Amino acid sequence: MSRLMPHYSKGKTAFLCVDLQEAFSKRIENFANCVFVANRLARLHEVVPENTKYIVTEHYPKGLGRIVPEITLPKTAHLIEKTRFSCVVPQVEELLEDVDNAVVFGIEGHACILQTVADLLDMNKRVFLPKDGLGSQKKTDFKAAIKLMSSWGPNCEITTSESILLQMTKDAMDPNFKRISKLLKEEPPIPL
Amino acid sequence: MSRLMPHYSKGKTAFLCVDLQEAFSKRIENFANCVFVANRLARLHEVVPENTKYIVTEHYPKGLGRIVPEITLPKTAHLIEKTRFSCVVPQVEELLEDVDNAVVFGIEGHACILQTVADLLDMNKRVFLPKDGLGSQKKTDFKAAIKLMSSWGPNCEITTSESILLQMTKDAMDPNFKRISKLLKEEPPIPL
Amino acid sequence: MSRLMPHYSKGKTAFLCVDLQEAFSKRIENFANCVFVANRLARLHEVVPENTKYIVTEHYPKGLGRIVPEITLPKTAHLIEKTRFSCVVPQVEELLEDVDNAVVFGIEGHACILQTVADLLDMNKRVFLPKDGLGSQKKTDFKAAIKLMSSWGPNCEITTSESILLQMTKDAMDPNFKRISKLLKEEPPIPL
Amino acid sequence: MSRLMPHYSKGKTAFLCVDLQEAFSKRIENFANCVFVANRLARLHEVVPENTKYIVTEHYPKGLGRIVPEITLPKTAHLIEKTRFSCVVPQVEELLEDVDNAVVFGIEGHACILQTVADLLDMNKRVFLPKDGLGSQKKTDFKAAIKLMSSWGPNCEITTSESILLQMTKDAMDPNFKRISKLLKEEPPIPL
């Protein structure tokens, strides 16, 4: 019945960076905020790496798209490729064999993101989504997938990246706070 | 506890094209997007016919309305007529005796659509609705029926037609993808 | 697990017309649509009286407010008065001893309406609310009470008065349809 | 299965005034409405003190912020300080050992407020939140935390301060009504 992200040191969390590729960069209004959140969670995972993996999927890469350069991946990143609309492919499954929580971000809300989270839920992981770092080409598709997923509690939760950073460091006197606090002073390309 | 549309080859799905008739064509702002979605799912069913039926109801046809010509029905279509506000009439019931999923689209959200889905739910079918291809004459009636139905999970889900096509072909290397992909490159009369 | 209003002839339904009085007439933007819906359900109940009661509460009447004249009450109306914020007072309780469904409409969404429906739910009645015929002085109070109540399913449902008339006459060949249809051709003071 | 605030004399209620400090005063658009609600519940608790405690947390006070002067605290107030993002610290826990309901208000919706309510829920208290007296620096963070929490029923409820005052005095002939009514005639800085 647990209700938000637990302290970062309880279990493991995968950051899952979904399909942020070149074909899309122009097609989605808040693509840049998605990039920002991808960077934010990237730097966060470097703060706390014995507790968090970071995962990049690229979808049919060569046929329109490699993972936009403005995302500076961590050296530890598990970069993987697929044609499945959902991120849950053989590679990522085993890479989640010991992971309790998935923080899922990227494009598109109603397509890969949506299928990815239903699969995660079926795997019994808790899923957490910064709305912050989600997008679709069209509003109607996005807005509908977002409401569907909001009805998928208690194991699915939509908040934002600032909410999520704060949920993992439950205290401002946390050994990692000064580092994490610094991320939070960065401002998005498109104002929230 | 299943969470989205399953792969098209698991079970059967009825496309249910509800009351898109002449009296209404002018009375509903997004009537044309409803037509677009009706065509979209029509062409889709022709892609995958051993797995999907297609059903058109016309409500009190002669007294104001036959099914708008700009919808090019599949040859396989089960076209039926009624006065019941809900589509669940004797004819359609038996035509669902072996169907697991219903994709319901048309007019009006708060009237025939709304009654139709509560009946489907009572029949234990999973219902999937492209918000895309729904409408009412007035916002207030639509918006309210849509929220009611969003609270009818897990067996009712409101997304859109692009979300739904992608949910049925779970992979971009699917034998049917190139065909289905082509539908998705078509753009609606009224931008989403 | 029933999902909408049943056919008018299955059980009994109270129409509950809540606090539409003079003090308020000016204080609420859609007061007039509330009046319209009050009239609509009034005429409806006259169509089907062996199955529906009609109930008017006036709240502290003499100290600012009798029930606005532009509502033409049915002769059968059970007009009652109180100081309780909720409509569930001794008089109305016994007047619901054999009633299965309550259609609740009036003012204010977050105050009398809100308390009234929580009490009804505690009495095991199904409650149905035309958003149509609800209002508050301020948006913020209304909008919040409306969302709370939307989360009170399966025995609470918010739709509109056209949705509700159609749900009770499940067929356009219903002996009462022509009469009920005629109500639906009336247009509200403030467009929906 | 209880559905709103019970009459003020059934059990105990803590008013919890969360982080309304100087650093924030300018950073949040509706900060002043939060102050208004803080005052409103302050005066209310003085009306009914054998049944309600009032609690102010200040978060890292000296390092940017003491509790804004325009809030005139009750003499009975339990003013406490912390670095935990959530209000549930050792001091407040024991101060809730005999409290059934918490009315939670302040800043920020997605941060301290959000963590505070998940902890309260874990403690089996009913939580009630006047949306009225909540805020965040950015819309996106607020709006998302608000929806998450709306899905946390039956023991969490978001309404407003007028709804909440009325829910605790279930009758306009209540010995405390004239006093409480007077609070309700006060108007917020930023119109609801």
Side-chain angles (χ1 to χ4, degrees), chain A residues 64-88:
Chain A
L64 297 69
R66 213 131 144 161
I67 200 241
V68 159
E70 157 70 72
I71 300 150
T72 17
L73 290 327
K75 312 303 179 140
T76 39
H78 309 259
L79 155 32
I80 121 269
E81 294 173 44
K82 36 70 150 178
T83 53
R84 173 140 264 238
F85 298 133
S86 172
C87 293
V88 189

PDB file of all heavy atoms in Angstrom, chain A residues 64-88:
ATOM      1  N   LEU A  64      15.833   6.614 -39.447  1.00  0.00           N
ATOM      2  CA  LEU A  64      15.434   7.834 -38.718  1.00  0.00           C
ATOM      3  C   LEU A  64      15.595   7.744 -37.143  1.00  0.00           C
ATOM      4  O   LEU A  64      14.625   7.497 -36.398  1.00  0.00           O
ATOM      5  CB  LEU A  64      14.017   8.317 -39.134  1.00  0.00           C
ATOM      6  CG  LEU A  64      13.496   8.799 -40.514  1.00  0.00           C
ATOM      7  CD1 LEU A  64      13.404   7.682 -41.601  1.00  0.00           C
ATOM      8  CD2 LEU A  64      12.119   9.524 -40.357  1.00  0.00           C
ATOM      9  N   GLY A  65      16.843   7.904 -36.673  1.00  0.00           N
ATOM     10  CA  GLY A  65      17.113   8.410 -35.340  1.00  0.00           C
ATOM     11  C   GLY A  65      18.116   7.733 -34.428  1.00  0.00           C
ATOM     12  O   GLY A  65      17.917   6.597 -34.005  1.00  0.00           O
ATOM     13  N   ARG A  66      19.167   8.474 -34.075  1.00  0.00           N
ATOM     14  CA  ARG A  66      19.997   8.166 -32.912  1.00  0.00           C
ATOM     15  C   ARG A  66      19.667   9.115 -31.753  1.00  0.00           C
ATOM     16  O   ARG A  66      19.105  10.184 -31.985  1.00  0.00           O
ATOM     17  CB  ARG A  66      21.469   8.298 -33.284  1.00  0.00           C
ATOM     18  CG  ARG A  66      22.381   7.347 -32.573  1.00  0.00           C
ATOM     19  CD  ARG A  66      23.313   6.625 -33.537  1.00  0.00           C
ATOM     20  NE  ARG A  66      24.587   6.466 -32.862  1.00  0.00           N
ATOM     21  CZ  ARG A  66      25.546   5.598 -33.184  1.00  0.00           C
ATOM     22  NH1 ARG A  66      25.402   4.736 -34.181  1.00  0.00           N
ATOM     23  NH2 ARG A  66      26.680   5.579 -32.490  1.00  0.00           N
ATOM     24  N   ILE A  67      20.037   8.732 -30.519  1.00  0.00           N
ATOM     25  CA  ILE A  67      19.618   9.442 -29.300  1.00  0.00           C
ATOM     26  C   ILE A  67      20.213  10.840 -29.143  1.00  0.00           C
ATOM     27  O   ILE A  67      21.291  11.007 -28.591  1.00  0.00           O
ATOM     28  CB  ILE A  67      19.771   8.563 -27.974  1.00  0.00           C
ATOM     29  CG1 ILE A  67      18.894   9.116 -26.830  1.00  0.00           C
ATOM     30  CG2 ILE A  67      21.237   8.361 -27.570  1.00  0.00           C
ATOM     31  CD1 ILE A  67      19.594   9.607 -25.517  1.00  0.00           C
ATOM     32  N   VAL A  68      19.478  11.838 -29.635  1.00  0.00           N
ATOM     33  CA  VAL A  68      19.846  13.266 -29.539  1.00  0.00           C
ATOM     34  C   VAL A  68      21.058  13.583 -28.612  1.00  0.00           C
ATOM     35  O   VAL A  68      21.038  13.245 -27.409  1.00  0.00           O
ATOM     36  CB  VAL A  68      18.595  14.131 -29.208  1.00  0.00           C
ATOM     37  CG1 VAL A  68      18.978  15.486 -28.591  1.00  0.00           C
ATOM     38  CG2 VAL A  68      17.720  14.287 -30.467  1.00  0.00           C
ATOM     39  N   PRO A  69      22.122  14.207 -29.189  1.00  0.00           N
ATOM     40  CA  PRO A  69      23.387  14.523 -28.497  1.00  0.00           C
ATOM     41  C   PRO A  69      23.235  15.360 -27.238  1.00  0.00           C
ATOM     42  O   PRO A  69      23.927  15.108 -26.254  1.00  0.00           O
ATOM     43  CB  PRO A  69      24.195  15.314 -29.553  1.00  0.00           C
ATOM     44  CG  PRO A  69      23.229  15.691 -30.600  1.00  0.00           C
ATOM     45  CD  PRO A  69      22.182  14.626 -30.606  1.00  0.00           C
ATOM     46  N   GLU A  70      22.351  16.351 -27.268  1.00  0.00           N
ATOM     47  CA  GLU A  70      22.140  17.192 -26.101  1.00  0.00           C
ATOM     48  C   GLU A  70      21.798  16.397 -24.803  1.00  0.00           C
ATOM     49  O   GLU A  70      21.848  16.946 -23.699  1.00  0.00           O
ATOM     50  CB  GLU A  70      21.172  18.342 -26.458  1.00  0.00           C
ATOM     51  CG  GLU A  70      20.399  19.001 -25.292  1.00  0.00           C
ATOM     52  CD  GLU A  70      21.257  19.850 -24.321  1.00  0.00           C
ATOM     53  OE1 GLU A  70      21.700  20.953 -24.728  1.00  0.00           O
ATOM     54  OE2 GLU A  70      21.438  19.443 -23.140  1.00  0.00           O
ATOM     55  N   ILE A  71      21.517  15.096 -24.907  1.00  0.00           N
ATOM     56  CA  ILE A  71      21.556  14.249 -23.706  1.00  0.00           C
ATOM     57  C   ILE A  71      22.959  13.624 -23.461  1.00  0.00           C
ATOM     58  O   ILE A  71      23.411  12.719 -24.201  1.00  0.00           O
ATOM     59  CB  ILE A  71      20.464  13.143 -23.669  1.00  0.00           C
ATOM     60  CG1 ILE A  71      19.065  13.758 -23.709  1.00  0.00           C
ATOM     61  CG2 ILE A  71      20.595  12.292 -22.391  1.00  0.00           C
ATOM     62  CD1 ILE A  71      18.006  12.877 -24.387  1.00  0.00           C
ATOM     63  N   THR A  72      23.613  14.101 -22.401  1.00  0.00           N
ATOM     64  CA  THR A  72      24.861  13.533 -21.947  1.00  0.00           C
ATOM     65  C   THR A  72      24.665  12.383 -20.970  1.00  0.00           C
ATOM     66  O   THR A  72      24.639  12.558 -19.758  1.00  0.00           O
ATOM     67  CB  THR A  72      25.877  14.587 -21.448  1.00  0.00           C
ATOM     68  OG1 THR A  72      25.215  15.829 -21.193  1.00  0.00           O
ATOM     69  CG2 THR A  72      26.975  14.802 -22.549  1.00  0.00           C
ATOM     70  N   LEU A  73      24.522  11.202 -21.562  1.00  0.00           N
ATOM     71  CA  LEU A  73      24.453   9.914 -20.886  1.00  0.00           C
ATOM     72  C   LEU A  73      25.518   9.698 -19.815  1.00  0.00           C
ATOM     73  O   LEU A  73      26.666  10.139 -19.977  1.00  0.00           O
ATOM     74  CB  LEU A  73      24.612   8.794 -21.932  1.00  0.00           C
ATOM     75  CG  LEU A  73      23.505   8.502 -22.949  1.00  0.00           C
ATOM     76  CD1 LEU A  73      22.124   8.797 -22.304  1.00  0.00           C
ATOM     77  CD2 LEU A  73      23.713   9.257 -24.271  1.00  0.00           C
ATOM     78  N   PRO A  74      25.158   8.982 -18.735  1.00  0.00           N
ATOM     79  CA  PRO A  74      26.157   8.543 -17.762  1.00  0.00           C
ATOM     80  C   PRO A  74      27.024   7.432 -18.373  1.00  0.00           C
ATOM     81  O   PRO A  74      26.556   6.720 -19.267  1.00  0.00           O
ATOM     82  CB  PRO A  74      25.310   7.985 -16.609  1.00  0.00           C
ATOM     83  CG  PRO A  74      23.900   8.321 -16.908  1.00  0.00           C
ATOM     84  CD  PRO A  74      23.805   8.536 -18.373  1.00  0.00           C
ATOM     85  N   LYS A  75      28.267   7.275 -17.907  1.00  0.00           N
ATOM     86  CA  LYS A  75      29.133   6.211 -18.444  1.00  0.00           C
ATOM     87  C   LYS A  75      28.547   4.835 -18.154  1.00  0.00           C
ATOM     88  O   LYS A  75      28.743   3.892 -18.924  1.00  0.00           O
ATOM     89  CB  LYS A  75      30.570   6.297 -17.894  1.00  0.00           C
ATOM     90  CG  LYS A  75      31.188   7.673 -17.950  1.00  0.00           C
ATOM     91  CD  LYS A  75      31.188   8.228 -19.369  1.00  0.00           C
ATOM     92  CE  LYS A  75      31.787   9.623 -19.403  1.00  0.00           C
ATOM     93  NZ  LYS A  75      32.650   9.782 -20.613  1.00  0.00           N
ATOM     94  N   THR A  76      27.816   4.732 -17.046  1.00  0.00           N
ATOM     95  CA  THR A  76      27.194   3.478 -16.655  1.00  0.00           C
ATOM     96  C   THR A  76      25.953   3.070 -17.485  1.00  0.00           C
ATOM     97  O   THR A  76      25.436   1.969 -17.290  1.00  0.00           O
ATOM     98  CB  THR A  76      26.846   3.484 -15.148  1.00  0.00           C
ATOM     99  OG1 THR A  76      26.359   4.777 -14.781  1.00  0.00           O
ATOM    100  CG2 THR A  76      28.092   3.169 -14.303  1.00  0.00           C
ATOM    101  N   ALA A  77      25.497   3.926 -18.406  1.00  0.00           N
ATOM    102  CA  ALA A  77      24.216   3.713 -19.141  1.00  0.00           C
ATOM    103  C   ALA A  77      24.063   2.381 -19.912  1.00  0.00           C
ATOM    104  O   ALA A  77      24.992   1.949 -20.590  1.00  0.00           O
ATOM    105  CB  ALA A  77      23.931   4.901 -20.089  1.00  0.00           C
ATOM    106  N   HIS A  78      22.896   1.735 -19.827  1.00  0.00           N
ATOM    107  CA  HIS A  78      22.673   0.517 -20.610  1.00  0.00           C
ATOM    108  C   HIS A  78      21.859   0.846 -21.815  1.00  0.00           C
ATOM    109  O   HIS A  78      20.616   0.837 -21.797  1.00  0.00           O
ATOM    110  CB  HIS A  78      22.021  -0.583 -19.811  1.00  0.00           C
ATOM    111  CG  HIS A  78      22.715  -0.857 -18.524  1.00  0.00           C
ATOM    112  ND1 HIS A  78      23.569  -1.922 -18.355  1.00  0.00           N
ATOM    113  CD2 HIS A  78      22.709  -0.182 -17.348  1.00  0.00           C
ATOM    114  CE1 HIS A  78      24.061  -1.892 -17.127  1.00  0.00           C
ATOM    115  NE2 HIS A  78      23.551  -0.849 -16.493  1.00  0.00           N
ATOM    116  N   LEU A  79      22.571   1.151 -22.879  1.00  0.00           N
ATOM    117  CA  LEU A  79      21.948   1.609 -24.080  1.00  0.00           C
ATOM    118  C   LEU A  79      21.515   0.425 -24.949  1.00  0.00           C
ATOM    119  O   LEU A  79      22.293  -0.465 -25.200  1.00  0.00           O
ATOM    120  CB  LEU A  79      22.886   2.604 -24.735  1.00  0.00           C
ATOM    121  CG  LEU A  79      22.954   2.962 -26.194  1.00  0.00           C
ATOM    122  CD1 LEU A  79      21.614   2.880 -26.909  1.00  0.00           C
ATOM    123  CD2 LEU A  79      23.429   4.390 -26.082  1.00  0.00           C
ATOM    124  N   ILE A  80      20.231   0.400 -25.334  1.00  0.00           N
ATOM    125  CA  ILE A  80      19.654  -0.744 -26.038  1.00  0.00           C
ATOM    126  C   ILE A  80      18.714  -0.287 -27.167  1.00  0.00           C
ATOM    127  O   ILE A  80      18.294   0.862 -27.211  1.00  0.00           O
ATOM    128  CB  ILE A  80      19.055  -1.895 -25.058  1.00  0.00           C
ATOM    129  CG1 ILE A  80      17.581  -2.169 -25.282  1.00  0.00           C
ATOM    130  CG2 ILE A  80      19.373  -1.691 -23.565  1.00  0.00           C
ATOM    131  CD1 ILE A  80      16.713  -1.337 -24.415  1.00  0.00           C
ATOM    132  N   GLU A  81      18.427  -1.186 -28.099  1.00  0.00           N
ATOM    133  CA  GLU A  81      17.761  -0.831 -29.366  1.00  0.00           C
ATOM    134  C   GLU A  81      16.638  -1.820 -29.614  1.00  0.00           C
ATOM    135  O   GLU A  81      16.735  -2.994 -29.247  1.00  0.00           O
ATOM    136  CB  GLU A  81      18.757  -0.871 -30.547  1.00  0.00           C
ATOM    137  CG  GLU A  81      19.894   0.197 -30.513  1.00  0.00           C
ATOM    138  CD  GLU A  81      20.983   0.002 -31.634  1.00  0.00           C
ATOM    139  OE1 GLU A  81      20.625  -0.259 -32.809  1.00  0.00           O
ATOM    140  OE2 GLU A  81      22.204   0.111 -31.330  1.00  0.00           O
ATOM    141  N   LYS A  82      15.567  -1.378 -30.249  1.00  0.00           N
ATOM    142  CA  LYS A  82      14.482  -2.318 -30.501  1.00  0.00           C
ATOM    143  C   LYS A  82      13.496  -1.881 -31.537  1.00  0.00           C
ATOM    144  O   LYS A  82      13.569  -0.776 -32.071  1.00  0.00           O
ATOM    145  CB  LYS A  82      13.720  -2.628 -29.215  1.00  0.00           C
ATOM    146  CG  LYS A  82      13.566  -1.446 -28.245  1.00  0.00           C
ATOM    147  CD  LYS A  82      12.634  -0.350 -28.716  1.00  0.00           C
ATOM    148  CE  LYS A  82      11.994   0.325 -27.465  1.00  0.00           C
ATOM    149  NZ  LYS A  82      11.087   1.458 -27.829  1.00  0.00           N
ATOM    150  N   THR A  83      12.561  -2.771 -31.814  1.00  0.00           N
ATOM    151  CA  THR A  83      11.457  -2.442 -32.703  1.00  0.00           C
ATOM    152  C   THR A  83      10.084  -2.590 -31.963  1.00  0.00           C
ATOM    153  O   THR A  83       9.089  -1.956 -32.329  1.00  0.00           O
ATOM    154  CB  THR A  83      11.572  -3.269 -33.987  1.00  0.00           C
ATOM    155  OG1 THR A  83      11.683  -4.662 -33.642  1.00  0.00           O
ATOM    156  CG2 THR A  83      12.858  -2.861 -34.758  1.00  0.00           C
ATOM    157  N   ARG A  84      10.067  -3.394 -30.899  1.00  0.00           N
ATOM    158  CA  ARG A  84       8.954  -3.458 -29.969  1.00  0.00           C
ATOM    159  C   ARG A  84       8.567  -2.036 -29.515  1.00  0.00           C
ATOM    160  O   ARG A  84       9.461  -1.218 -29.221  1.00  0.00           O
ATOM    161  CB  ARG A  84       9.334  -4.360 -28.802  1.00  0.00           C
ATOM    162  CG  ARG A  84       8.354  -4.421 -27.659  1.00  0.00           C
ATOM    163  CD  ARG A  84       8.242  -5.838 -27.160  1.00  0.00           C
ATOM    164  NE  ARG A  84       7.080  -6.471 -27.786  1.00  0.00           N
ATOM    165  CZ  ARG A  84       6.048  -7.001 -27.131  1.00  0.00           C
ATOM    166  NH1 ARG A  84       6.014  -6.993 -25.799  1.00  0.00           N
ATOM    167  NH2 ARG A  84       5.052  -7.557 -27.817  1.00  0.00           N
ATOM    168  N   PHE A  85       7.258  -1.717 -29.516  1.00  0.00           N
ATOM    169  CA  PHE A  85       6.827  -0.358 -29.112  1.00  0.00           C
ATOM    170  C   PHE A  85       7.126  -0.158 -27.638  1.00  0.00           C
ATOM    171  O   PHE A  85       7.673   0.872 -27.245  1.00  0.00           O
ATOM    172  CB  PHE A  85       5.376  -0.031 -29.473  1.00  0.00           C
ATOM    173  CG  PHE A  85       5.107  -0.044 -30.936  1.00  0.00           C
ATOM    174  CD1 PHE A  85       3.995  -0.712 -31.450  1.00  0.00           C
ATOM    175  CD2 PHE A  85       6.001   0.574 -31.827  1.00  0.00           C
ATOM    176  CE1 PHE A  85       3.754  -0.742 -32.848  1.00  0.00           C
ATOM    177  CE2 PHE A  85       5.788   0.535 -33.228  1.00  0.00           C
ATOM    178  CZ  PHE A  85       4.641  -0.123 -33.733  1.00  0.00           C
ATOM    179  N   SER A  86       6.836  -1.176 -26.842  1.00  0.00           N
ATOM    180  CA  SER A  86       7.280  -1.212 -25.462  1.00  0.00           C
ATOM    181  C   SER A  86       8.764  -1.490 -25.241  1.00  0.00           C
ATOM    182  O   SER A  86       9.322  -2.426 -25.843  1.00  0.00           O
ATOM    183  CB  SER A  86       6.546  -2.305 -24.744  1.00  0.00           C
ATOM    184  OG  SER A  86       7.133  -2.436 -23.482  1.00  0.00           O
ATOM    185  N   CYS A  87       9.368  -0.703 -24.341  1.00  0.00           N
ATOM    186  CA  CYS A  87      10.706  -0.916 -23.782  1.00  0.00           C
ATOM    187  C   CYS A  87      10.969  -2.264 -23.136  1.00  0.00           C
ATOM    188  O   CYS A  87      12.122  -2.655 -23.015  1.00  0.00           O
ATOM    189  CB  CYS A  87      11.052   0.141 -22.738  1.00  0.00           C
ATOM    190  SG  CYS A  87      11.248   1.808 -23.397  1.00  0.00           S
ATOM    191  N   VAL A  88       9.942  -2.997 -22.731  1.00  0.00           N
ATOM    192  CA  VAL A  88      10.187  -4.310 -22.120  1.00  0.00           C
ATOM    193  C   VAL A  88      10.553  -5.367 -23.181  1.00  0.00           C
ATOM    194  O   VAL A  88       9.703  -6.111 -23.696  1.00  0.00           O
ATOM    195  CB  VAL A  88       9.038  -4.746 -21.186  1.00  0.00           C
ATOM    196  CG1 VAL A  88       9.423  -5.993 -20.393  1.00  0.00           C
ATOM    197  CG2 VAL A  88       8.662  -3.576 -20.233  1.00  0.00           C
TER     198      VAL A  88
END
